[PDB]
Amino acid sequence: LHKEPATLIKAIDGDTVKKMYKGQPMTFRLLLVDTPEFNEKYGPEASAFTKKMVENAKKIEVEFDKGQRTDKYGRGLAYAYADGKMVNEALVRQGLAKVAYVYKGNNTHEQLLRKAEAQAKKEKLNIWS
Template sequence: MNKRRTVYLKNLIFILSMVMIGLLAGCSSLLTDTDNQSADRVSATVIKVVDGDTIHVRINGKDETVRMLLIDTPETHAPGKSVQMYGPEASQFAEKELPVGSPIQIEEGVKGYKRDKYDRLLGYIYLKNGDMYNAKVVEKGFARVGYIYPPNTKHLDMLKEKQADAEKAHLGIWSIPGYVTSSGYDMTKVKTQKASTSTNTSPSQSSSSRSCKIKGNINSSGAKIYHIPGDPSYNQTKPEQLFCSVSEAKKAGFRAPKR
C-alpha cells in the first residue's frame, strides 16, 4: 500500500512539475516578447529630413541615414528626375512630424537585414507620442506601400489597410487616376490630367467660364492653387481651370497661394 502511494505521489509531483515548467515557459515567452519589443527600438534624434521616407538621425553619437521600411513617397531629390507630384507635400509632412532635434525611436529591420545596399539603416519610425510615422504618411495619402522585401514585412498588413483607406478617400497621390503604380509614380498621368482638365470642356462650359475670373493652376510640384484678381501673380498665371467663386475652387481641391 505504501509502495503504491509512493509511486502515486511521485507521478503527481512529476505532473505538477511539468505544469509549472510550462507555465514558467509561457511567462518567460511573454516577458521575452515584451523585452524584444523595446529592445528592437533604439532611441535617436532627428538631424535632417531628406524627404518623406528618408531622414538623418544621431544614434549614440553616430550619424545614420534611415530609410523607412515598406513605404515610398514621390521623389524630390532623385538625380536625373524631376520633382514628382506630392513629393514636396510628403517632405513637408515629414518636417512637421519629425522636426530637427526631436527624439524618436526606430524599430530596426530583422537581424541580418537591417541595412539596404546603400548601407542605410532600415526601420519603422515612432514619434514621441508613440505613433508610427510610416503609417501616418501612408494614411495621409503622401506615400504608397512599396519596397516589400521579406523578412522585413512585420507591419505590412497594417500599412496596406492604411493605404486602402487613403485610396478609397482619394487622398493625395490617390487623387490622380493611374499615378500610383506597383513600381512608383507615373508623372505622365499628371500631365494627362492637366490636359484633360483644360481641353475636355463643353462649348457651353467654355462660354460661361469666360466670365469666371478665378484662375486654377497646378504648379510644377503638383500643388493646386487658385488666384483671384488682384493677387500679385494673377496676370502671369496660366489657368488650367477657371472658377466663378472661391468656394467652387476649394471644392475642386485648389487652395489660396501662400502669403
C-alpha cells in the first residue's frame, strides 16, 4: 500500500472525515474500525478525538487497501494518517473504536489494529472500561 495526499474539509464523526482527494470532495469512512454514533456512549469522545487529530495535522494522507475503494454509500474506504500517525489505529488504541468490518481483501492492517485493541482492552480504556 501507499499513502496519497488529501486535505481536510471537515471532521464529521469518530470514523468519517470529509477530505479533498485528487481535487474532489469525498467523505471517507475509516477502514477496519467502528466508532460509536454521536448519540451513543463514547460517540462524542470519538468524534472529538478524530476531529482534533485531523484538524491539528500539518499533513493529511489517505491509503487505500487492495480491494474496494468506495462503499455502497459512495464513501471512500481508506486508512487516514495525520502527520504520519494512523487515525484508525489511534482510535482503536485509545478504546474509542472497535476493530470491525473486516472484509477479505481490504484487511491489510487488521493485525496491527487487533494488537492496538488488545492493549486498549488490557488498559480498560473508554469503551473497554
